[PDB]
From Swiss-Prot:
Disulfide-linked positions: none
This protein's GO CC annotations: plasma membrane
The record's account of how the chain is modified after translation: Autophosphorylated. The phosphoryl group is rapidly transferred to DcuR.
Entry comment, domain topic: The periplasmic domain is involved in C4-dicarboxylate binding and sensing. The structural disorder in the cytoplasmic PAS domain has an important role in signal transduction to the kinase domain and may be the decisive structural feature that characterizes the activated kinase.
Function, in words: Member of the two-component regulatory system DcuR/DcuS. Involved in the C4-dicarboxylate-stimulated regulation of the genes encoding the anaerobic fumarate respiratory system (frdABCD; nuoAN; dcuB; sdhCDAB; etc.). Weakly regulates the aerobic C4-dicarboxylate transporter dctA. Activates DcuR by phosphorylation.
Residues of the full protein shown: 45 to 180 of 543
BP GO annotations: regulation of DNA-templated transcription
Localization per Swiss-Prot or TrEMBL: Cell inner membrane
Gene Ontology molecular-function annotations: ATP binding; phosphorelay sensor kinase activity
Gene that this sequence comes from: dcuS
Protein name: Sensor histidine kinase DcuS
């Protein structure tokens, strides 16, 4: 929620970027959610907190990644991408049993500064309340 707001924004944007930066990526974009290969940005899943919906999207949003399977298939017309899909930063809250979590939005360029896809990163949240209450 709050804590993730600032560091997940930065901390998860960057590790999500090491793998969203690999090659399977532009090639995942050449594919869709259920057949992509979001397992490497998940390399960002591990470094961040063993959890997240670290998603790279073809031009079709959807949590490519997530600990729970059902929260994935939901996100759509979320309108948060309407700004990123076309180049723009945006963050919003999701709300499901234990799923209460924050997520950021980022755009993908065809490699010409031309917006063609979006990178979202949702922190499922949970094993963190303690740290979130005293420190933040």
């Amino acid at each position: 929620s709050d804590m993730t707001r600032d560091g997940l924004a930065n901390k998860a944007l960057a590790v999500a970027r090491t793998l969203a930066d690999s090659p399977e990526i532009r090639q995942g974009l050449q594919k869709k959610p259920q057949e992509s290969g979001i397992q490497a940005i998940a390399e960002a899943v591990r470094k961040r907190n063993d959890l997240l919906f670290i998603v790279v999207t073809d031009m079709q949003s959807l949590r490519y990644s997530h600990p729970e399977a059902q929260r994935i298939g939901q996100p759509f017309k979320g309108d948060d991408i309407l700004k990123a899909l076309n180049g723009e930063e945006n963050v919003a809250i999701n709300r499901g049993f234990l799923a209460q979590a924050l997520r950021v939005f980022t755009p993908i360029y065809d490699e010409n500064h031309k917006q063609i896809g979006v990178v979202a990163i949702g922190l499922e949240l949970s094993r963190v309340t303690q740290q979130i209450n005293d420190s933040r």
